[PDB]
Amino acid sequence: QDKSVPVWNGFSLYTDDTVKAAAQYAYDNYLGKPYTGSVESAPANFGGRMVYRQHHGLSHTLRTMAYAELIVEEARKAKLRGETLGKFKDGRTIADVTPQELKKIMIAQAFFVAGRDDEASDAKNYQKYHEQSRDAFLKYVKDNESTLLPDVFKDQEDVNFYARVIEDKSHDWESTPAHVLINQGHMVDLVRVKQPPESFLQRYFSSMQRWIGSQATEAVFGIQRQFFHATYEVVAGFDSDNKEPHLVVSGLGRYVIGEDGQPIREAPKKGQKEGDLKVFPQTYKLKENERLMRVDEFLKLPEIQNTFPGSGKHLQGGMPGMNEMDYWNRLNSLNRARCENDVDFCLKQLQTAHDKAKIEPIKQAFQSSKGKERRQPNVDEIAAARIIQQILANPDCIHDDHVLINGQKLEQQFFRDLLAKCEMAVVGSLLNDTDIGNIDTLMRHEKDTEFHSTNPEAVPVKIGEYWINDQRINNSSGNITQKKHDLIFLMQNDAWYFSRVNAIAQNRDKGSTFKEVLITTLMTPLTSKALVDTSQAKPPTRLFRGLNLSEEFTKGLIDQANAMIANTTERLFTDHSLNDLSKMSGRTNASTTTEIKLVKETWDSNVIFEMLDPDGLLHSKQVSEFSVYLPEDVALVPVKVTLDGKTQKGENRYVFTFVAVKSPDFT
Ligand SMILES: [Hg+2]
Ligand SMILES: [Hg+2]
Ligand SMILES: [Hg+2]
Ligand SMILES: [Hg+2]
Ligand SMILES: [Hg+2]
Ligand SMILES: [Hg+2]
Ligand SMILES: [Hg+2]
Ligand SMILES: [Hg+2]
Ligand SMILES: [Hg+2]
Ligand SMILES: [Hg+2]
Numbered sequence: 001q002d003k004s005v006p007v008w009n010g011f012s013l014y015t016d017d018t019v020k021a022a023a024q025y026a027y028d029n030y031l032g033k034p035y036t037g038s039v040e041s042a043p044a045n046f047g048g049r050m051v052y053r054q055h056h057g058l059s060h061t062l063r064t065m066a067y068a069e070l071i072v073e074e075a076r077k078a079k080l081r082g083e084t085l086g087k088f089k090d091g092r093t094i095a096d097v098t099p100q101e102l103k104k105i106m107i108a109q110a111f112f113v114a115g116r117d118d119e120a121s122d123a124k125n126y127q128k129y130h131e132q133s134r135d136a137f138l139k140y141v142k143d144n145e146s147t148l149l150p151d152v153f154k155d156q157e158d159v160n161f162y163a164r165v166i167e168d169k170s171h172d173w174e175s176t177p178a179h180v181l182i183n184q185g186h187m188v189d190l191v192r193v194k195q196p197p198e199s200f201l202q203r204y205f206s207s208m209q210r211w212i213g214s215q216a217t218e219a220v221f222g223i224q225r226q227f228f229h230a231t232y233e234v235v236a237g238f239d240s241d242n243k244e245p246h247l248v249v250s251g252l253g254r255y256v257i258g259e260d261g262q263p264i265r266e267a268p269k270k271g272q273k274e275g276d277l278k279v280f281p282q283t284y285k286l287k288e289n290e291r292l293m294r295v296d297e298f299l300k301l302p303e304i305q306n307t308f309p310g311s312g313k314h315l316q317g318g319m320p321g322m323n324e325m326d327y328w329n330r331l332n333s334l335n336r337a338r339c340e341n342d343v344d345f346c347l348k349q350l351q352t353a354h355d356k357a358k359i360e361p362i363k364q365a366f367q368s369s370k371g372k373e374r375r376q377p378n379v380d381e382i383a384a385a386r387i388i389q390q391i392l393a394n395p396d397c398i399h400d401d402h403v404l405i406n407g408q409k410l411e412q413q414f415f416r417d418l419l420a421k422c423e424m425a426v427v428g429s430l431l432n433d434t435d436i437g438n439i440d441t442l443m444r445h446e447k448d449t450e451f452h453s454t455n456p457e458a459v460p461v462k463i464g465e466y467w468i469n470d471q472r473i474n475n476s477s478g479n480i481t482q483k484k485h486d487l488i489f490l491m492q493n494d495a496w497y498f499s500r501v502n503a504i505a506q507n508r509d510k511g512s513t514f515k516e517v518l519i520t521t522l523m524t525p526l527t528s529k530a531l532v533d534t535s536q537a538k539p540p541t542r543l544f545r546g547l548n549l550s551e552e553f554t555k556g557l558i559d560q561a562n563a564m565i566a567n568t569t570e571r572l573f574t575d576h577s578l579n580d581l582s583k584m585s586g587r588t589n590a591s592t593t594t595e596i597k598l599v600k601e602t603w604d605s606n607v608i609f610e611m612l613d614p615d616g617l618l619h620s621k622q623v624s625e626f627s628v629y630l631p632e633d634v635a636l637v638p639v640k641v642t643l644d645g646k647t648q649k650g651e652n653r654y655v656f657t658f659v660a661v662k663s664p665d666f667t
Contacts, residue, residue: 007558013068013347014348046333054340057340063189108166192235193234236317240311246298252282264280300312449519487530488530539618543620547591548606564579586630591605618631
């Protein structure tokens with residue numbers, strides 16, 4: 001076996017302009033148009049906007065194209081792990097598809113159902129609609145020969161073949177990657193809707209598995225679920241205990257259980273311990289003591305259980321961590337209609353989901369370290385936060401020497417008690433932005449309240465006026481993050497304020513009025529909250545580092561990246577359990593930048609490390625340029641390798657993309 005795979009050239013559905021434009025034309029000219037036929041063709045309304053083709057529309061189409069990218073990706077990975085994939089007649093496998101091929105396929109995919117006039121499913125209409133699809137495709141190419149011509153499709157003959165795949169006449173069927181990726185991506189999109197779902201899933205699975213193997217096939221179906229979430233469509237449950245009749249998908253038939261209580265089988269061919277399961281039509285009349293095989297019975301058959309990882313499993317439907325009511329609303333949202341009518345938006349959703357799906361399995365592969373633990377607020381602190389919020393919101397409760405709020409008279413000592421005994425950072429974490437906004441409320445009411453420095457000769461200041469004027473001029477839009485900033489500023493800079501506040505907060509003040517005590521009690525937790533909510537300084541999410549490597553050495557590192565990438569797959573039913581690369585990517589260093597142009601145009605680096613830091617695990621420091629430290633327990637795990645053109649001299653330029661991950665297991 002040869003586990004070689006050629007290096008990808010950067011091609012993707014999400015970033016190629018030709019493909020995008022092909023989908024856009026498919027939308028504008030076909031998929032976004034009302035159906036003109038009568039079969040099950042009513043437009044559907046999602047959050048108030050119409051989706052004219054909710055089954056075979058834009059989102060469906062784009063999903064089929066994302067599936068092609070995902071299938072080829074998981075096939076390549078399977079070949080790299082050393083598995084033996086199904087072969088076409090020419091000896092190729094799906095792991096051998098090139099970017100130039102996949103791009104022709106995606107463009108063809110864009111028009112695969114453009115030709116449908118409604119949802120009629122009989123064969124005379126299938127054929128007409130696929131002829132109409134073919135014409136659409138061929139019109140597209142004619143109108144764009146110039147750019148598509150030599151550059152995407154070799155010649156008309158090449159164009160004519162993809163046109164034939166779309167037309168899908170049986171006498172044109174071949175085992176080719178185009179034929180198979182197109183039919184497969186198309187049919188797997190039905191998992192979202194068809195019932196019983198266990199029946200359809202096992203069929204579609206077993207049909208993919210023969211091309212790409214079982215572990216890849218789990219990845220493709222696992223990720224598909226995320227694509228459905230991303231495009232605001234239903235994610236189906238999977239129950240291995242489902243009691244309804246099994247549906248024999250091809251032929252829409254059934255299996256029958258006889259009087260013995262056993263499935264009826266065809267006489268056994270030789271070297272078969274048991275005969276083939278006899279497929280009956282739905283018009284077959286059941287005898288007495290005869291019934292249909294249930295889904296659960298089916299999945300428990302040794303021949304299915306031997307071969308399908310979903311036997312004995314369960315997948316909850318919908319979305320992990322949402323209500324039914326929210327989930328239902330999410331499916332019925334404007335976001336569904338946007339996906340269905342806006343190419344850019346829908347591609348972006350799938351993109352984001354596809355990128356996340358490469359990182360998430362890399363995270364599940366290691367014990368994440370236990371984040372810090374935190375005491376709950378005690379009842380006093382919750383009560384302190386309540387009463388501050390109420391005072392802020394109802395400042396007319398504030399009088400010269402006390403607050404009167406819930407039948408009680410709150411005097412000076414009460415607020416000093418809050419400061420002495422509640423932990424004000426904790427109090428401050430119970431407070432919210434509406435509370436920050438009510439600083440204005442308080443300050444308006446207290447406009448001429450005098451706030452006195454600890455300096456006896458200082459002029460008393462009118463804090464409310466101070467606050468309020470300053471906010472009208474410099475934060476007139478009422479912007480709340482900015483109020484946080486301004487409140488910190490006041491605490492840091494104006495000693496007439498901070499001196500009295502700190503003196504009271506430390507119980508060593510002298511000649512403090514009641515209002516000063518009160519105001520100190522209110523502002524201190526708010527200021528705490530402000531520091532905290534504005535000091536969340538985020539490390540950049542995406543960095544680039546430039547290197548200058550012999551192409552030989554580079555190939556070394558490719559083989560190692562391929563080997564880590566190939567071993568991490570999204571699962572569906574089954575589980576999970578230091579290189580030249582890990583040393584090289586990991587060493588602390590200074591030729592880093594957030595600007596890709598720096599790395600390419602200016603430095604002309606022939607090898608680029610792209611570092612993704614979604615979780616901000618990388619200690620970095622600016623020397624555009626930058627220097628990066630890897631915490632001991634943080635590792636850069638490869639996610640992707642590709643050829644990204646050439647340098648100015650003409651040498652191949654490679655990009656290795658890594659993701660920063662935190663684990664005890666590293667150190
Ligand atoms: Hg429908
Ligand atoms: Hg179909
Ligand atoms: Hg279940
Ligand atoms: Hg089960
Ligand atoms: Hg008042
Ligand atoms: Hg009151
Ligand atoms: Hg009052
Ligand atoms: Hg307290
Ligand atoms: Hg004074
Ligand atoms: Hg600030």
